[PDB]
Write a protein that binds this ligand. Structure first.
Ligand SMILES: [Mg+2]
Ligand SMILES: [Zn+2]
Ligand SMILES: [Zn+2]
Ligand SMILES: [Zn+2]
Ligand SMILES: [Zn+2]
Ligand SMILES: [Zn+2]
Ligand SMILES: [Zn+2]
Lengths: 56, 137, 100, 142, 65, 127, 44, 88, 138, 351, 114
RNA sequence: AUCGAGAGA
DNA sequence: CTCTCTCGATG
């Protein structure tokens, strides 16, 4: 995580298969390809913090 | 198939393209102590053994092992071993569970004494893996 | 490298460095890979049986002492001179469950 | 319908690598903790969590999300409640709960006591500093 | 392992053509191309499927267990 | 898996039924065709196991179905396996009606050649 | 239950308090026999 | 004449199984004859487990030079044979 | 690399004896001012004295190695412009096999010692399975 | 959560660092540490009244823990204490102490230069403690002769874990010296009134960390404390009984060694004090040093719950601010949602 | 692992209807029909047959995601012409053409050898 | 769990 | 001064 664009809040879309599916145009800020790259996902636990994610 | 990813023909996959066999061996051994204290291979009951595993032991036999051919999955128990440390609950559980995330079929079970005269066992489980979305090529 | 170690280096290590005050060390003998079981019966160890039973594919060293004796076990590199597989043919390897 | 551009098409020797998704995929929602630091264990096979490292913290700081950073560093990890003496400010307090008996051998404190929420790792650090002849006195006032 | 039953790409049966292929190679003394041609393998995917295959089961059968 | 890809007779398949549609338990004779396979190493030489060795057990009751297609010249068919000397393969096969959309083993066709306008007079392709 | 030796075509039935070795052989490598309860395979 | 090239491969050596096992066996055997010297001065009863367990340890852990963490050969001299592919 | 090998290590003593018995002045009997153009001979990093007329010695040694009398593993370095002769019987030296080019060809020029006959014998050994690599080395 | 406490919930506003005065050390303690025995005593699954007392914290999944009970999940850590036969040096202060001995002459206990000097007036004008000490240390270590007591101040140099003199300084001697520097001289070189004194830098008696710091599955800290207690009892034995001149000193240096290496194990001194398994042992200093340390590894960043990790792939049919989440992960990761009239139906369906 | 069942490509799930007709809010006299358990095979054909009807203003199908076997079909017809009738006419036309094609292929097959 | 080793981007 | 799986020997 080199800059703030390495951690960004997304909307969940539950899909089949075992891969984190992301939009192509979001590749650049994360600096990632799909040649085996792995990513992490964190889930908020209260209203104020998910508000922090959605509004910031 | 952008940014170093690829699209594979599902039909060809069904016909056996890039399919694989995956074998995994678990090894266990009966421990020995100075006062002739020895762990034993068996299928323990919940009323006679401490701790135990959350998984089921019903696939075990009298010798505390699985018969090669029985399908295993989740947190099933592959090897049943107990260690003693009248009184209720005289045995501690030392059973080995199948990998929490893996599954498959018991390919082949091997029972053999050690160089120090210790009865130890290697259980090989087989799982066929089929090329899926996300597999590295 | 391993063959050089067995056929020459070992004797140099034993003889040219050690002498006590007396007991002088003589020739070194390297056997074929064997196992002294808990049964007491010592028998020939083959690589497949060694890997299956978590044993150590090693031979025994025997030195002549003056004024014979077992001094330890040396792990044997596979397909070396003191290995059974070096002289074995393809059919022999197939019988010994060793891949050709 | 035909494709305009023609496609480079032909046999090529490909190979399947060892890295497969079902061996990589991992997810934990409240699992086994460690003993020393009381933080989520390390590894997928042991049902562990993922390290919210220094750089992630830096990113959350950059965003400004404070409550999120607090949530990752408390509720999502090791959230511990400790008692502090209102005098010296150390974890000397002997809190006899269910009897409301908050004792403190050394300053004779029974009425002037405090209660704070800190990470168990912070508690560990403070205790280790106390074992290294240092007093991390914690006051709750300016 | 053993000769794949059908071609991955299109789906044409090829598992019944292995021994015939071998015979066309050793008995009639033909090259691989013509042998593959005579077996009705015109598309290079099936042609590949047979030509590229390595029969490893013959080595596997050498063991007694 | 190899058995799954074996081509079977699907002539009167239209008077066979989906196991998911049949009112039986698991499978029956109105939905599925059962064929056995018993092979054993006999000779010192390699004993080949083909698709001809498959033997229909279930009751076809008139319908042309279940019979393994053998376009082989020697009449063997698909080479299933190879047995050594004392090796044995004893199994049973329940074949059911299926769509190639569900699995490519139910594919009735191989490669379908397809071409329109060989002169590119429509100009659908920029060469 | 019953077992089968590795480097020979035998069929030992020695349960617990027996184990190694083998009947008319001498090797201590014993494999376990296949289960009687059959397992199905979705031929796909 | 310019400075010597310290990256010249001709002025470098590769120690294989031979030299390594030679150093190790020299150590373990000197230890053995030392122990035997002790048993002799205390007064056929020779501890063969020294050489065996020594070689086995150094070959198992990859930590060349018996059980002393002061070794700089902690970079794993002996490793598990990678058997994923024949080429591997 | 595919053909690279590691020197096992041999005994330099017979090479030393050969040198001394083939016109090598002992280092203890070396007078620099009366023989400046004397090539100093090194063996395993040891100066065993100098030697005048180094070419004949070098050709002799090379001939012996190529014959087999001296272990083919042993390396022999002749530095002309530095007037030095370094023979290494050291172990751990990484070497590789090479074709030998000699100009002993009368009706021709500088050609490979290995000829199509040798290759034919090699492939004869290949088809039969008595003429192997060691024969090429000897 | 845990349990209801009568104490108010407050936020940490300030952190006042300082030293641990032996008085406060023994006053804070709730258990004396005499026996070096760990837990078992003559085939008994319990705790001896020496090390790992039940007062320090019970360790057997019990419901009791030193009268206060509250199990072992609520109980933080109850410190102990051990008295040393002779005072020793705190390793992390070896430099600082060695500097103070150069800022104040021996025997007496006074600063060399005062307001009578010209440069000292300028050096003592700095308000910052560090800069003040750094300024005075340079303009005071050159003084040899001296308030009165004109004793020739020796040249002190560092050697191992003791100090020498050139006209060997005992630890008790330096204790007696730092005990007589008084209050006014403390402010002149950084130290504080009732927080940090030079007479507290040296270790008279040292605190004993509770079992939650050194757990058992024993911990290295338990072994090191056992070594310290061993050297202590050995020193006491050599002192009370037959006390040779060149024997008890070795025991003093031994206790000093074990105490010094109990905190810092990576010193300039070659003896790194290995263990039984050949391990260089884990000191308290090594527990904090990053990046795998306690601070950078357990405080600045730590493993968290409600997290997932997977191989990523591109999807042209997902929006920019969308993320594809595998169904299994969706079932695994969860969110606590309070029941309200707006969502009671949906939540009921989900349940 | 997380891979969906294959039959979910052609077997209607629990409660899932075949066609979902929805009134389009954008353009007047338009409709969006959701086809379940169907791919391009049906959508392309229907859409191509809806462009033959000269009383149909708009006709376009799309598969929103390849994971799921379903496609949306938007149809806009002239006033005084219900789009359902356009879909029905298209379908019937398809069926007729396929019937004639089948008959012709059969007759042409009977006249062959080998 | 504590130290070494291989590997992922 | 330098995010993951993993193996395999050690207590
Ligand atoms: Mg990448
Ligand atoms: Zn207090
Ligand atoms: Zn094909
Ligand atoms: Zn039925
Ligand atoms: Zn047998
Ligand atoms: Zn308590
Ligand atoms: Zn003075």
């Amino acid at each position: 995580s080199l800059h703030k664009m390495s951690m960004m809040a997304h909307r969940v879309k539950v899909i089949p298969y075992s891969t984190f599916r992301l939009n192509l145009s979001v590749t650049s800020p994360y600096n990632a390809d799909f040649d085996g790259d792995e990513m992490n996902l964190h889930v908020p636990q209260s209203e104020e913090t998910r508000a922090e994610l959605s509004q910031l | 198939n952008q940014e170093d990813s690829m699209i594979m023909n599902q039909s060809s996959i069904d016909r056996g393209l890039f399919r694989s066999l995956f074998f995994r061996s678990y090894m266990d051994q009966e421990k020995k102590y100075g006062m002739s204290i020895t762990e034993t291979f068996e299928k323990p009951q919940r009323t006679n053994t401490l701790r135990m595993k959350h998984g089921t032991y019903d696939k075990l036999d009298d010798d505390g092992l699985i018969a090669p051919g029985v399908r295993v999955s989740g947190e099933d128990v592959i090897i049943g071993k107990t260690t003693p440390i009248t009184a209720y609950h005289s045995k501690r559980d030392a059973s080995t569970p199948l990998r929490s995330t893996e599954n498959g079929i018991v390919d082949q079970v091997l029972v053999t004494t050690n160089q120090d005269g210790l009865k130890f066992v290697k259980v090989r489980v087989r799982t066929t893996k089929i090329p899926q979305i996300g597999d590295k090529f | 490298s391993f063959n050089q170690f067995v056929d020459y280096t070992l004797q140099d290590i034993i003889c040219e460095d050690s002498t006590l005050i007396e007991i002088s060390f003589g020739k070194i003998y390297v056997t074929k890979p064997m196992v002294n079981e808990s049964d007491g019966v010592t028998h020939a160890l083959y690589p497949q049986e060694a890997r299956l039973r978590n044993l150590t594919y090693s031979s025994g060293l025997f030195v002549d002492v003056k004024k014979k004796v077992f001094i330890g076990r040396l792990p044997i590199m596979l397909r070396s001179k003191n290995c059974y597989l070096s002289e074995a043919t393809e059919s022999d390897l197939y019988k010994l469950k060793e891949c050709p | 319908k035909k494709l305009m551009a023609q496609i480079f098409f032909g046999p090529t020797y490909y190979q399947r690598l060892r890295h497969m998704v079902d061996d990589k995929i991992h997810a934990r929602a409240r699992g086994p903790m460690q003993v020393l630091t009381r933080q989520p264990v390390e590894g997928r096979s042991r049902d562990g969590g993922l390290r919210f490292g220094e750089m992630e913290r830096d990113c959350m700081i950059a965003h400004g999300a404070a409550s999120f950073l607090k949530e990752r560093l408390m509720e999502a990890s090791d959230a511990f409640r400790v008692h502090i003496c209102g005098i010296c400010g150390l974890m000397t307090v002997i809190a006899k709960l269910n009897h409301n008996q908050f004792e403190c051998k050394g300053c004779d404190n029974k009425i002037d006591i405090y209660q704070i929420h800190i990470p168990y790792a912070a508690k560990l650090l403070f205790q280790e500093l106390m074992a290294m002849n240092i007093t991390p006195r914690l006051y709750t006032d300016r | 392992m053993i000769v794949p039953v059908r071609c991955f790409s299109c789906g044409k049966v090829v598992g019944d053509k292995w021994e015939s292929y071998l015979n066309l190679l050793q008995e009639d003394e033909l090259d691989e191309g013509t042998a593959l041609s005579r077996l009705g393998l015109k598309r290079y995917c099936c042609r590949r499927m047979i030509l590229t295959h390595v029969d490893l089961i013959e080595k596997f059968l050498r063991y007694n267990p | 898996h190899r058995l799954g890809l074996i081509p079977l007779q699907s002539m009167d398949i239209e008077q066979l039924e989906y196991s998911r549609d049949c009112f039986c338990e698991d499978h029956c004779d109105k939905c599925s065709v059962v064929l056995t396979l018993q092979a054993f190493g006999e000779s010192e030489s390699t004993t080949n196991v083909y698709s001809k060795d498959l033997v229909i057990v279930s009751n076809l009751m008139g319908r042309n179905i279940g019979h393994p297609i053998i376009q082989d010249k020697e009449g063997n068919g698909v080479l299933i396996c190879k047995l050594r000397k004392g090796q044995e393969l004893k199994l049973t096969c329940v074949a059911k009606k299926g769509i190639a959309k569900e699995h490519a083993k139910w594919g009735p066709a191989a490669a379908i050649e397809f071409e329109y306008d060989p002169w590119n007079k429509l100009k659908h392709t920029d060469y | 239950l019953k077992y089968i030796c590795a480097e020979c075509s035998s069929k030992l039935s020695l349960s617990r308090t027996d184990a190694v070795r083998c009947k008319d052989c001498g090797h201590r490598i014993l494999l376990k026999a296949r289960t009687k309860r059959l397992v199905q395979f979705e031929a796909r | 004449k310019d400075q010597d090239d310290r990256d010249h491969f001709g002025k470098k050596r590769l120690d294989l199984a031979g030299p390594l096992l030679a150093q190790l066996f020299k150590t373990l055997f000197k230890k053995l004859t030392k122990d035997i010297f002790r048993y002799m001065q205390r007064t056929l009863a020779i501890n063969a487990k020294t050489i065996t367990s020594g070689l086995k340890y150094a070959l198992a852990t990859g930590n060349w030079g018996e059980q002393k963490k002061a070794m700089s050969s902690r970079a794993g001299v002996s490793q598990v044979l990678n058997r994923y592919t024949y080429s591997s | 690399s595919l053909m690279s090998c590691i020197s096992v290590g041999t005994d330099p003593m017979p090479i030393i004896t050969f040198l001394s018995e083939w016109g090598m002045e002992p280092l203890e009997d070396y007078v620099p001012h009366q023989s400046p153009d004397a090539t100093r001979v090194f063996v395993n990093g040891v100066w065993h004295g100098v030697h005048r007329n180094p070419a004949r010695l070098m050709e002799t040694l090379r001939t012996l190695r190529r014959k087999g009398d001296i272990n083919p593993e042993v390396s022999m370095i002749r530095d002309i412009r530095e007037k030095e002769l370094k023979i290494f019987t050291d172990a751990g030296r990484v070497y590789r096999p090479l074709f030998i080019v000699e100009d002993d060809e009368s009706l021709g020029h500088k050609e490979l010692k290995v000829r199509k006959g040798h290759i034919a014998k090699l492939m004869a050994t290949e088809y039969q399975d008595e003429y192997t690599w060691s024969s090429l080395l000897n | 959560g845990q349990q209801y406490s009568s104490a108010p919930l407050r936020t940490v506003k300030e952190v006042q660092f300082g030293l641990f005065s032996p008085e406060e050390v023994r006053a804070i303690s709730v258990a004396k540490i005499r026996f070096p025995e760990t837990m078992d005593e003559t085939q008994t699954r319990a705790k001896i009244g020496g090390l790992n007392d039940p007062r320090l914290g019970s360790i057997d999944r019990n419901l009791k823990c030193q009268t206060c009970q509250e199990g072992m999940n609520e109980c933080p850590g109850h410190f102990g204490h051990i008295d040393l036969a002779k005072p020793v040096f705190h390793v992390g202060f070896i430099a600082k102490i060695k500097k103070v001995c150069e800022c104040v002459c021996m025997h007496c206990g006074k600063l060399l230069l005062d307001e009578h000097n010209e440069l000292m007036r300028q050096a003592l004008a700095i308000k910052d403690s560090k800069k003040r000490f750094a300024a005075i240390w340079t303009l005071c270590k050159t003084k040899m002769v001296c308030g009165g007591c004109g004793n020739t101040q020796p040249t002190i140099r560092k050697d191992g874990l003791k100090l020498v003199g050139s006209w060997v300084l005992s630890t008790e001697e330096i204790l007696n010296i730092f005990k007589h520097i008084s209050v006014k001289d403390f402010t002149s070189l950084g130290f504080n009134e009732v927080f940090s004194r030079p007479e507290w830098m040296i270790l008279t008696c040292l605190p004993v960390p509770p079992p939650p710091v050194r757990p058992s599955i024993e911990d290295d800290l338990t072994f090191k404390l056992a070594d310290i207690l061993k050297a202590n009892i050995s020193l006491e034995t050599l002192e009370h009984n037959g006390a040779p001149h060149h024997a008890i000193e070795e025991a003093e240096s031994l206790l000093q060694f074990h105490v010094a290496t109990y905190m810092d194990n990576d010193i300039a001194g070659q003896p790194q004090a290995l263990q039984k398994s050949g391990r260089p042992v884990k000191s308290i200093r090594a527990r904090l040093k990053g990046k795998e340390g306690r601070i950078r590894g357990n405080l600045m960043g730590k493993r968290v719950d409600f997290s997932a990790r997977t191989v990523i792939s591109g999807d042209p049919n997902l929006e920019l601010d969308q993320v594809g989440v595998p169904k299994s992960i969706a079932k695994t990761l969860t969110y606590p949602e309070v029941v309200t009239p707006y969502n009671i139906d949906r939540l009921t369906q989900l349940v | 692992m997380n891979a969906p069942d294959r039959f979910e490509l052609f077997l209607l799930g629990e409660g899932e209807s075949k066609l979902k007709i929805d009134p389009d809010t954008k353009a007047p006299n338009a409709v969006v029909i959701t086809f379940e358990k169907e791919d391009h095979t049906l959508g392309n054909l229907i859409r191509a047959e809806l462009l033959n009807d000269r009383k149909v203003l708009f006709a376009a199908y799309k598969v929103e995601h390849p994971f799921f076997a379903r496609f949306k079909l938007r149809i806009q017809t002239t006033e005084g012409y219900d789009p359902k009738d356009a879909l029905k006419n298209a379908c019937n036309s398809i069926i007729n053409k396929l019937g004639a094609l089948k008959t012709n292929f059969e007759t042409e097959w009977n006249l062959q050898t080998l």
